[PDB]
Nucleic acid binder design. Structure first.
Ligand SMILES: [K+]
Ligand SMILES: [K+]
Ligand SMILES: [K+]
Ligand SMILES: [Mg+2]
Ligand SMILES: [Mg+2]
Length: 136
RNA sequence: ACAU
DNA sequence: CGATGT
């Protein structure tokens, strides 16, 4: 502890897993929604959590912001660190769109630099991350 | 077991 | 109850 309030918080929302995936980023202090991705018809929770972090990195870099990013996803934080999303989701026609976005997110990571700290939101201590969809 |  | 991941 404690919370770094000067930060961006991201989270995925889904209908089914695998299922319809969306994500959003919010100002941790105020909850102001800063970006929201259009729903993707089929994806996994972890793909969406991964895309949300990468989008946050791109959003902050474009704005010359040094704020950290909070995510509640152990998996996606590691995938971003590794620059490699190790998803089990079948690559087929139904999943082509999500897999294109994930491939493109990995590609951006491998062609850009950033100093943004990517931090674990401590749900057990602090409650739900501020970007949560409130579906559970 | 942990995190979603 | 189920699924995605380390
Ligand atoms: K939720
Ligand atoms: K959670
Ligand atoms: K499990
Ligand atoms: Mg989450
Ligand atoms: Mg959530």
């Amino acid at each position: 502890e404690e919370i770094i309030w000067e930060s961006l918080s991201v989270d995925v929302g889904s209908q089914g897993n695998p299922g319809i995936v969306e994500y959003k980023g919010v100002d941790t202090k105020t909850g102001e929604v800063l970006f929201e991705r259009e729903p993707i018809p089929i994806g996994t929770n972890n793909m969406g959590e991964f895309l949300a972090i990468v989008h946050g990195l791109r959003y902050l870099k474009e704005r010359n912001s040094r704020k950290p990013i909070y995510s509640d996803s152990q998996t996606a934080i590691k995938w971003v660190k590794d620059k490699k999303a190790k998803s089990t989701l079948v690559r087929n026609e139904e999943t082509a769109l999500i897999w294109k976005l994930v491939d493109e997110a990995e590609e951006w990571l491998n062609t850009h630099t950033y100093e943004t700290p990517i931090l674990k939101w401590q749900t057990d201590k602090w409650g739900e991350i501020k970007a949560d969809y409130g579906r559970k």
